[PDB]
């Protein structure tokens with residue numbers, strides 16, 4: 282019958298839950314345009330700092346059989362650029378836009394949010410605040426909530442135990458404006474060593490870098506589901522290890538409303554969204570689901 | 585030329601760096617015997633608590649294409665059992681024995697260590713203290729160091745940033761008795777969801793469990809290398825994601841002295857050690873290394 286990947290959240294309609302993960306294929310105008318032109322339900326701009334950053338020396342990203350490792354160092358065009366893209370360029374008629382923000386301090390986030398406010402108001406761009414200790418997180422969210430008169434989401438690093446799921450959820454649940462939680466950012470500071478070259482594969486930080494892709498899917502599912510459970514009032518956006526509609530299906534089963542695609546998108550480019558939508562639809566059709574609502578968060582436990 | 589996987593550490597000679605990861609194929613006499621009979625350089629008994637524990641309801645382990653997930657819940661025959669194995673059964677002529685200890689409180693560890701002391705003294709069993717909060721860690725090590733008159737090692741959870749590498753290393757470095765650091769335990773609380781069944785795959789903890797296997801190799805390498813760098817006075821034992829001699833070679837390059845094998849061993853049985861020694865030798869032969877010393881810790885960075 283009639284299947285739909287439509288997602289409705291944040292006062293928006295998304296054609297499908299897919300979007301790039303922040304930082305992937307979303308740094309330049311060209312990329313943002315490509316993402317916007319893609320079949321993705323949405324996009325998020327590269328996490329921005331107040332000013333442009335060159336980011337780290339290359340190689341700073343490496344695709345791997347099981348994912349990716351990167352230490353990009355937040356190369357980005359700077360907030361004004363993404364603000365301007367959101368304010369003046371982005372075609373919201375095509376899809377909603379998220380703007381990822383990653384100030385290097387609370388003050389930077391506060392100042393960016395102060396300015397993002399009007400554009401969020403005028404254009405509907407949605408903040409994904411990159412949060413990737415808990416007191417600091419609470420302070421950050423307080424400071425941002427103080428100056429930012431809109432719902433926003435937060436991009437979380439993965440956590441690895443319930444104590445942390447609980448503590449993080451507790452924080453986030455303090456902030457009604459935090460309407461979505463994106464789980465997860467990279468698994469931090471993995472170290473890929475190329476057995477052939479007997480070396481690391483990225484240059485910054487002695488080769489340590491965030492892992493994405495296949496490596497991170499169960500972690501991502503865990504986090505998605507953990508926050509899905511602990512933040513019942515909030516939306517969870519999944520991010521981590523999505524290469525296929527089936528992976529996305531897992532994200533949604535774990536609780537994801539939107540499903541972000543990082544490494545796989547980096548490796549395939551924006552055409553991946555046509556394939557993901559089609560695959561997820563295929564998965565849904567095989568499983569006799571018509572909407573994401575029908576199985577979102579419905580992963581069955583055995584206990 | 586002549587190649588050797590021999591490892592000399594902790595006043596022992598190991599024929600090769602391989603051993604099981606604690607908890608894998610090392611719970612029962614039969615497993616311990618099998619590990620001892622295997623080609624592994626060593627073995628470590630299942631992390632024990634003062635008394636036997638049934639562990640968690642099954643399924644509590646699931647092998648996966650990329651690794652494993654488990655929430656065993658520390659099923660173990662109890663300390664007396666492993667102590668007795670170390671004291672009276674283990675053939676130290678075949679290989680050294682590590683005894684993993686995972687008391688559920690400092691007190692439990694202290695009480696077991698007090699009793700382990702004489703057996704370590706008399707038989708040479710070596711404690712791997714399962715540490716998998718930094719104050720708690722310091723307190724545990726202090727307590728164990730107070731009462732345990734031997735060098736021992738610690739099984740560490742993976743860390744994911746340098747702040748944690750630094751903090752953990754700083755702590756471990758306060759304890760001269762901590763002579764090896766085993767990196768790593770599982771990546772905590774991943775959630776594997778079976779797209780077919782739309783369910784989790786292990787029963788305890790709503791399906792959340794420690795990830796091992798291919799998922800964890802870069803994390804393991806990161807941790808091994810991080811502590812290798814930060815704890816130059818200590819040996820690092822690698823654990824995580826070893827399925828092949830090539831993987832083991834990575835561990836060693838990252839800094840590993842011993843290389844523990846969990847998931848792959850769980851899946852393959854103790855004959856894996858023949859294959860691993862052979863493969864690691866083959867890797868070393870192709871690379872013209874003759875000893876592990878020649879490349880241990882020599883992973884080349886690009887910066």
Ligand SMILES: Cc1cc2nc3c(=O)[nH]c(=O)nc-3n(C[C@H](O)[C@H](O)[C@H](O)COP(=O)(O)O)c2cc1C
Nearest residue numbers: 302303304328465466467493494521522542543544
């Ligand atoms: C090249 C690259 C750049 C990234 N930059 C950002 C970023 O700017 N902001 C952010 O929140 N996450 C960033 N990440 C993390 C991704 O958003 C995503 O959380 C991570 O890659 C896991 O998703 P994946 O498994 O689909 O890769 C980056 C990841 C990659 C690979």
Ligand SMILES: Cc1cc2nc3c(=O)[nH]c(=O)nc-3n(C[C@H](O)[C@H](O)[C@H](O)COP(=O)(O)O)c2cc1C
Nearest residue numbers: 605606607631768769770796797824825845846847
């Ligand atoms: C079935 C199973 C039981 C485990 N039990 C223990 C344990 O008792 N003590 C411990 O330190 N680690 C335990 N672990 C973690 C392993 O020692 C190892 O750290 C982890 O599996 C990563 O290694 P791998 O990638 O080779 O699996 C267990 C792992 C598995 C799979």
